[PDB]
Write a protein that binds this DNA or RNA. Sequence first.
DNA 1: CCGAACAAGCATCAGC
DNA 2: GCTGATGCTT
DNA 3: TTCGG
Length: 326
Amino acid sequence: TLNGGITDMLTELANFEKNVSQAIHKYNAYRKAASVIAKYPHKIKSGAEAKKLPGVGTKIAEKIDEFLATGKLRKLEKIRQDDTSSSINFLTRVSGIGPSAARKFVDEGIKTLEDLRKNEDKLNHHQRIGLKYFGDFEKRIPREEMLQMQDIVLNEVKKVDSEYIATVCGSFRRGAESSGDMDVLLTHPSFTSESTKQPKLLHQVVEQLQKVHFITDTLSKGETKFMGVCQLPSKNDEKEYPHRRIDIRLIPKDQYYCGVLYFTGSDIFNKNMRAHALEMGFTINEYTIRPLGVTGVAGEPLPVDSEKDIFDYIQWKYREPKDRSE
DNA sequence: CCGAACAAGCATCAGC
DNA sequence: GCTGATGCTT
DNA sequence: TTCGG
Ligand SMILES: Nc1nc2c(ncn2[C@H]2C[C@H](O)[C@@H](COP(=O)(O)OP(=O)(O)OP(=O)(O)O)O2)c(=O)[nH]1
Ligand SMILES: [Cl-]
Ligand SMILES: [Mg+2]
Ligand code: NA
Ligand code: NA
Ligand code: NA
């Protein structure tokens, strides 16, 4: 991490704008600048050198100059001293609490973890589980544990129905040595863009993973998206493992390639690629890539038989998952 | 200067 | 109940 | 906050 100091500052600014100012485009600007700088293979010596990078503008170059000169950013130092900003930033670290709820809680005087714990009755279900596992969800997952989790998920899925295909995506598929959570893409031949021939396809999998005590809690659940909590089993007299966030996404079987591109990410990579798609005259979601008409309206889905097919449409060279961590 | 900035599932709420 | 907007999340 | 046009 050549420029870790700069990218930390930009990320802290990103988080301030999202959580406190509720300024989504400022948030995206700082996040993109941090991503482009994190990829940059030289130690940055000035804001002017940084300003040559796409996504670093005048204002960010000035902050980089102040940071390189002093090691600090005065703007951030004040933000950390502001109690309301500090408390709002803190509360958004609970899963289910965003900037609106965080500011509403602070208004009601709920400003600390203890404050939250004694006010469980003011939390919705998602927020309540996020508070329950607050510390655990802060811990990263070593890839060695990701492998054990993969093995459990893929084998339990096979026991429900041998025609399910479960793929672990996210940072795991990009080869990361540690992950924030586990992301499972799920397909079954009975669920295509053309019909749903069996009900409960996601439910059956969730229920099986609950039965074997792998899934421990649910944050949200519908017919195609599950967001929840899981935990590896531990040996006799060993510590328990931390509880972990798990997302499962059932995708139409014929739309796997758009689905695995979406769920492999990164999130910034997806934003970058979807923005370039638009400039090339296409729109990409997790299901399809479609041409944009002369008006702007999305046309019919184009045929896709590999992830690389999607890169070709927008005239991008293919990038392996490992080169998509932006 | 100024408009666009990725795309969408689930939970929750207001209004009907 | 349903529809649409908003929050929060991937 | 940044960029393209
Ligand atoms: N198009 C789009 N996709 C997103 C967005 N956020 C997340 N995703 C997709 C790409 C992610 O790689 C993938 C999983 O979301 P995660 O939050 O788990 O990110 P990821 O696994 O990459 O990193 P992690 O190690 O879990 O912190 O979902 C988004 O804002 N837009
Ligand atoms: Cl903004
Ligand atoms: Mg993940
Ligand atoms: Na630039
Ligand atoms: Na949060
Ligand atoms: Na995830």
